Design an enzyme around this catalytic site. Structure first.
Site, PDB file in Angstrom:
ATOM      1  N   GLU A   1       0.793  -1.248   0.000  1.00 52.53           N
ATOM      2  CA  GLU A   1       0.000   0.000   0.000  1.00 52.53           C
ATOM      3  C   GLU A   1       0.825   1.298   0.000  1.00 52.53           C
ATOM      4  OE1 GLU A   1      -2.882   0.483   3.108  1.00 52.53           O
ATOM      5  OE2 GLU A   1      -3.666   2.371   2.251  1.00 52.53           O
TER       6      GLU A   1
ATOM      7  N   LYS B   1      -2.510  -1.945  -3.270  1.00 49.66           N
ATOM      8  CA  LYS B   1      -3.589  -1.099  -2.770  1.00 49.66           C
ATOM      9  C   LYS B   1      -3.168   0.324  -3.052  1.00 49.66           C
ATOM     10  CE  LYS B   1      -6.508  -0.096   1.277  1.00 49.66           C
ATOM     11  NZ  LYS B   1      -7.223  -0.617   2.544  1.00 49.66           N
TER      12      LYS B   1
END
Lengths: 295, 295
Positions: free
Chosen positions: A178, A213
């Site tokens: 992420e 992500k």
């Protein structure tokens, strides 16, 4: 083994999205307040953690979570050590709800430098990974932050993300990387340009797939080449400050990218609303995020 | 007369923000659903409008609306023709709550051209203005939309906004001009650059003050020269797709700009939650938006 393979299949093929429930202690007062539980209502850390655990239990046990629209769920470490209906949380997610369980494995951020905030080093990562395997957790999540279109900084973000990822893989867990670009970035498209370029160069050297992500890009469909890369299992998207309606709208314009929302999934829900309304609103929010995720 | 002057003073001097309650019929299903009232729960337009009127009544009669943190409220025309506790809505806003009442006076948008959506012409505007004066409404609001950093298009947005504004002034009402730049604009800073430049050139030719409702800028504090212009009464800010937490955070970084939020003010609130929780969460959201507005 056969979970693993069925879970891998879900994560690769299944339409739907992942619910992020992975707020650390430092982020739980904010989530509680948004659920109508003011800081003023508890005064120990234990009481706070119970309170957010009741919330998550109320979400997970709700009929809305039995839909198959949510294919994965990301857990805070304390929740993984907790139970739902007398059963370890990850096990309940998979055995009773057919949801693939993940765990957040980062310990927070370093001070900003080079327009970015790298993850604090975590020496005992591999110990957390083996613990997670013991709970039958399938994958991990880790968050790092990009505030500026800085090439050195973004180079570093990505390289730390993949180092951690190769390490997590070793334990037989699928990592979600992420690298969040702040939505208020002065030059968001430019930063996302660098990010994409670094990301692909790393993926070209990978021998096993990972997941990603990311913030929903400024340029619609910008991440196509990523989604299509054979070493990319699935791309999921943070809300990052957009309302649920805004994240969904922009998400609809990014083909093949699915949601991974925390507070946005849950806006509207509160402690002292009837069970009936809680399930209805939860069911609707999920339907909305699902329809946006599947475009 | 003495209202007018006391209301003018509030609007110019008072710290706090404006609550936007001015959703047209076309936007009311979305607001109702977010309040936990699904389209499936009413099946006439009259029933829908009652339902959103109960919501707004529940907000306006709530102790949270008696705080002075909210200095103005923007109304949909139907609400102005309705009552709160047997009293015309605008009158209740001022006499019983010390909130300055405004009315949305636009009839929607034209199709996009030149990267912008101008307001649909409204021949009977002046009739609405005289009606509003009859209800002791103090001011108006009107919304127009900028999707791209197009100089002709933005020139037109601003010129239509000020024409409407000079007309509204004539009736002795203070107009809030709302030239919203979409938060997903490919070149937001650039569009806001053009917007600011057009806005100032118009203000230099004005002989009476107006107010402005804008998207929170990409460049922190970009609107300083506007806030400071002697023909600018007050600058307020739309959320435009940001969550309440994100709008507040960015709003805190824009000195002298106050909030004007609709759905963001109200996220978390629902039909079937207890009165007690409704007031508490409403009180908290308001406190949050207030603290951000006053920086």
């Amino acid at each position: 083994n056969a979970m693993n393979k069925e879970q891998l299949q879900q994560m690769r093929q299944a339409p739907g999205f992942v619910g992020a429930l992975d707020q650390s202690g430092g982020s739980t007062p904010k989530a509680l307040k948004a659920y109508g539980i003011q800081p003023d209502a508890y005064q120990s850390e234990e009481e706070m953690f119970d309170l957010i655990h009741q919330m998550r239990t109320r979400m997970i046990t709700s009929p809305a979570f039995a839909t198959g629209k949510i294919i994965g769920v990301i857990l805070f470490e304390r929740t993984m050590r907790g139970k739902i209906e007398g059963m370890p949380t990850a096990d309940f997610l998979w055995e009773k709800r057919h949801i693939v369980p993940f765990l957040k494995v980062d310990k927070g951020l370093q001070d900003e430098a080079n327009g970015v905030q790298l993850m604090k080093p975590f020496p005992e990562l591999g110990k957390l990974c083996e613990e997670a395997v013991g709970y039958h957790v399938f994958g991990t999540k880790m968050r790092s932050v990009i505030k500026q279109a800085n090439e050195q900084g973004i180079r570093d973000i990505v390289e730390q993300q993949f180092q951690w990822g190769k390490e997590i893989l070793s334990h037989g867990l699928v990592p979600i990387l992420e690298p969040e670009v702040d939505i208020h970035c002065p030059e968001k498209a430019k930063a996302e340009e660098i990010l994409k370029r670094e990301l692909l160069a790393q993926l070209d050297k990978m021998t096993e797939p990972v997941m990603l992500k990311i913030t929903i890009p400024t340029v619609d469909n910008f991440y196509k080449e990523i989604i299509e890369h054979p070493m990319m299992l699935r791309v999921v998207a943070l809300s990052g400050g957009y309302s649920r309606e805004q994240a969904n709208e922009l998400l609809s314009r990014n083909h093949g990218v699915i949601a991974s929302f925390s507070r946005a999934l849950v806006e509207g829900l509160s402690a002292r609303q009837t069970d009936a309304e809680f399930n209805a609103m939860l069911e609707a929010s999920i339907e909305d995020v699902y329809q946006a995720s599947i475009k």
